[PDB]
Amino acid sequence: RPGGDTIFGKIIRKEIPAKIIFEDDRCLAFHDISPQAPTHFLVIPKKHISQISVAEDDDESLLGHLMIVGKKCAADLGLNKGYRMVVNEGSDGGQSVYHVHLHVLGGRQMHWPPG
Amino acid sequence: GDTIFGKIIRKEIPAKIIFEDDRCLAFHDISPQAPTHFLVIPKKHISQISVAEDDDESLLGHLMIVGKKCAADLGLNKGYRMVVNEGSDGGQSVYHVHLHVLGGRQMHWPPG
Ligand SMILES: O=c1[nH]cnc2c1ncn2[C@@H]1O[C@H](COP(=O)(O)O)[C@@H](O)[C@H]1O
Numbered sequence: 260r261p262g263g264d265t266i267f268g269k270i271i272r273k274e275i276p277a278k279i280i281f282e283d284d285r286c287l288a289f290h291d292i293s294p295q296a297p298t299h300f301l302v303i304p305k306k307h308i309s310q311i312s313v314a315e316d317d318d319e320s321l322l323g324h325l326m327i328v329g330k331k332c333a334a335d336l337g338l339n340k341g342y343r344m345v346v347n348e349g350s351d352g353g354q355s356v357y358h359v360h361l362h363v364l365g366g367r368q369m370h371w372p373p374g
Numbered sequence: 375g376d377t378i379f380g381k382i383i384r385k386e387i388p389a390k391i392i393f394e395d396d397r398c399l400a401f402h403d404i405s406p407q408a409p410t411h412f413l414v415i416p417k418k419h420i421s422q423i424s425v426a427e428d429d430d431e432s433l434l435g436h437l438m439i440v441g442k443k444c445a446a447d448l449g450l451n452k453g454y455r456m457v458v459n460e461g462s463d464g465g466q467s468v469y470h471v472h473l474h475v476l477g478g479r480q481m482h483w484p485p486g
């Protein structure tokens with residue numbers, strides 16, 4: 260199936276509902292169901308890449324597109340005071356859904372260290 | 375650019391450099407928040423991700439691929455976290471866009 264076998268595949272195929280912010284041929288942006296900030300959404304590729312560590316050289320433009328869409332969506336959602344983008348990789352990264360995605364968090368002061 | 379990261383790119387002040395090519399530089403953070411903590415920055419002075427243009431797509435993806443490759447080269451095979459800070463709320467410390475890569479310990483949630 261298009262979108263892979265994770266829960267994010269079900270969202271892409273619209274088998275389960277999501278609060279979608281943006282969609283195109285390459286990616287999908289939607290709100291996180293467990294927000295860690297007043298605004299918290301994800302940007303994901305429609306292509307199933309399990310994690311960033313296995314991305315190929317030819318995935319470069321796709322990954323950049325995730326960041327560009329993340330920035331545009333943040334602007335659209337009025338995060339003019341700033342925001343934080345996050346990618347969790349693997350065990351130490353805290354990854355739980357193995358479909359590459361970018362978090363965008365805003366609407367409050369983010370702290371250092373980032374976890 | 376007129377930031378400390380510009381000086382580092384120009385080799386005017388030292389940094390522990392990990393990788394370089396014609397369009398980016400990776401180097402260890404001087405104030406590390408994890409056993410491994412480094413930065414990947416473009417040589418193009420983009421002040422912050424919110425001002426990146428569509429034409430910068432390839433370059434931004436390049437930062438992430440270089441980050442991935444450097445993480446592997448530094449032995450972060452148990453995982454890591456990538457971070458880009460924007461503006462005041464994002465805690466952006468230098469107005470030259472930079473990609474953080476942190477690992478060598480469990481990263482926690484929320485990410486700040
Ligand atoms: O069905 C969903 N809709 C929206 N967000 C989700 C869903 N399932 C998991 N997530 C989020 O996806 C992230 C997965 O964790 P991560 O792999 O560490 O980024 C968490 O922020 C979850 O709350």
